[PDB]
Amino acid sequence: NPYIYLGGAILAEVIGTTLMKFSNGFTRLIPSMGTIICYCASFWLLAQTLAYIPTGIAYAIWSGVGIVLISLLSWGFFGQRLDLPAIIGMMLICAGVLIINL
Amino acid sequence: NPYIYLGGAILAEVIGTTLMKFSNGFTRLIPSMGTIICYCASFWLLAQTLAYIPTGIAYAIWSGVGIVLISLLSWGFFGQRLDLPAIIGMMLICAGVLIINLL
Amino acid sequence: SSVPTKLEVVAATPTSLLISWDAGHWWEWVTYYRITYGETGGNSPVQEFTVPGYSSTATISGLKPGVDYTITVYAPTSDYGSPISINYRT
Amino acid sequence: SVPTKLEVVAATPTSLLISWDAGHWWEWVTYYRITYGETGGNSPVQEFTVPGYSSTATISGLKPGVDYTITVYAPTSDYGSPISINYRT
Ligand SMILES: C[P+](c1ccccc1)(c1ccccc1)c1ccccc1
């Protein structure tokens, strides 16, 4: 259960930071409201998933599955390339998530 | 100068996250207001570093210092609530972080 | 050692009741108190509204004169203490 | 680009109900600001703002017969030049 909401908040923020890059200075009303709704949800999702998983533990897993889903979504259907040594760094984060997971 | 605002924004988020553990689902005033204030500072500082420092190194430092500062702050104000196989899992998550950003 | 405390009716009126309570110390302050008011007889539901946790007062309007009402102030959760409830005849 | 097409729908001697094309969903801004002052300039102009989801706005408290200049600005100049028109009540 706890690692389900943590990922839901990870998905929430990643959608928040992307909708922010789409909208201008919180001017585009639709993706601006999208960012506010996403951050509020992720704020209340991270708030509720912290009483079970330690603070440092959830910070890591987030920093992980975040950039994972960020660069995954980046190569997903936006841009590509970047400094891509390989997906070997993506497979690293997954491992740490696992050996900290249930 | 422009490298300092990162660590301050790191630490401000570090402080805000630890303050969120005191908000009680955002149902306690003073910690709830504090977390909102803390994140407004790290935002404004991070926005002041994106104008100079690249996003890759600015954030790789954030992940590392943060995953160290908040995890060490969760040992004095608390300790551990449900430790599991490895602490190094977080360091190797941080490792894979530093090699999809820097590399 | 619970919150809130000291729920009193400042001003009254046939159709309105001004009430207040002891929010406690600065660490006992919550972000939203939800307050409930209904008829003492109990042949109806109970009206409810929230109010920011930085305000210790709350105004209630739209009441029927002469009737005795019961007013209860809650906390965001039940962790802060038993909610405080009182009575008043307008 | 946005806003586009600023015209006056209904016109009372002391009021002008105006409207504009707010764009389209993904090009909706968060707010527009509307400026109405006398066409001459003996005094400053009057101004207000409207949320970005609303496409219409009412301008009250005008003087009859006077020609007015109404302008609707985007949140920033990045969405295109602000569109302005004139109307004689
Ligand atoms: C508290 P965080 C956040 C979470 C969810 C929505 C919006 C912001 C954050 C997310 C993941 C990992 C660490 C921290 C944040 C806030 C201000 C400045 C930098 C980061």
Pocket test for ligand 1, best of A6, A13, A17 (most atoms within 8 A of CB): A13
| A57: nearest Cα among A12, A100, A7 | A100
C70: domain range?
1-90
Best A20, A26, A30 member to test D by mutation, with max D CBs in 10 Å, is A30
Q: Is there a contact between D31 and D57 (Cβ–Cβ < 8 Å)?
A: no
Q: How far does C30 lie from chain B, in Å, by closest CA?
A: 4
CA–CA dist B85, A101 (Å, integer)? 8
Total of domains in chain D? 1
Count the neighbouring beta carbons within 10 Å of the beta carbon of residue C63.
19
Q: Quick one: which atom of ligand 1 is closest to the CA of A9? A: 5
Q: By three-state DSSP, how is residue C76 classified?
A: coil
Taking CA atoms, C44 is separated from C47, C53, D35, in Å, by 9, 28, 51
Does the beta carbon of C78 lie under 8 angstroms from any beta carbon of chain B?
A: no
Taking CA atoms, B47 is separated from B5, B40, B42, D44, in Å, by 9, 11, 8, 37
| B23: nearest Cα among D58, A50, C66, D11 | A50
Ligand 1 centroid to Cα of residue C12, in Å, is 47
Q: Which two tokens stand for residue A3?
A: 């690692």
Chains B and A physically touch (3 or more Cβ atom pairs below 8 Å): yes
Q: How far does B63 lie from chain C, in Å, by closest CA?
A: 30
| A89: nearest Cα among B89, B56, B99 | B99
Does the beta carbon of D28 lie under 8 angstroms from any beta carbon of chain A?
A: yes
Q: Which two tokens stand for residue B26?
A: 């955002």
Q: Which two tokens stand for residue A87?
A: 């997906």
Resolution in A: 3.2
Residues of A in contact with D52 (CB under 8 A): 29
Ligand 1 centroid to Cα of residue A82, in Å, is 23
Q: Is there a contact between B34 and B19 (Cβ–Cβ < 8 Å)?
A: yes
DSSP state of C78: G
Taking CA atoms, B56 is separated from B41, B52, B53, C38, C52, in Å, by 20, 12, 9, 58, 41
Chain D residue nearest residue A31, CA to CA = D26
Residues of A in contact with D33 (CB under 8 A): none
Q: Helix A55-77 and helix A2-22: axis angle, to 10°?
A: 50
Name beta bridge partners: D72. Answer: D34, D83
State the structure-solving technique: X-ray
| A65: nearest Cα among A19, A29, A36, A101 | A101
| D88: nearest Cα among D40, D48, D49 | D40
Does the beta carbon of D33 lie under 8 angstroms from any beta carbon of chain A?
A: no
CA–CA dist B34, B78 (Å, integer)? 19
Q: Which two tokens stand for residue B50?
A: 């994106």
CA–CA dist B100, B102 (Å, integer)? 6
Ligand 1 neighbours by CB, cut-off 6 Å: A 13, 16, 39, 42-43, 59, 62-63, 66; B 13, 17, 39, 42-43, 46
Instruction: Label residue B76 exposed, middle or buried (CB < 10 Å: 0-12, 13-18, 19+).
Output: exposed
Sign for the CA dihedral angle at A32, B36, B46, A50 comes to negative
Q: Which two tokens stand for residue B1?
A: 């100068």
Q: D touches which chains (3+ CB pairs under 8 A)? A: A
Strands of the sheet with C68-73, listed across from one edge: C47-52, C32-39, C68-73, C84-89
Q: How far does A74 lie from chain B, in Å, by closest CA?
A: 12
Best A17, A80, A100 member to test B by mutation, with max B CBs in 10 Å, is A100
Q: Which residue's entry shows tokens 């003073």? A: B30
Q: Which two tokens stand for residue C21?
A: 């309570």
Taking CA atoms, D28 is separated from C39, D55, D59, in Å, by 47, 10, 22
Residue D79 neighbours by CB under 8 Å, 6+ apart: A27, D1, D2, D3, D23, D27, D29
CA–CA dist B26, A46 (Å, integer)? 11
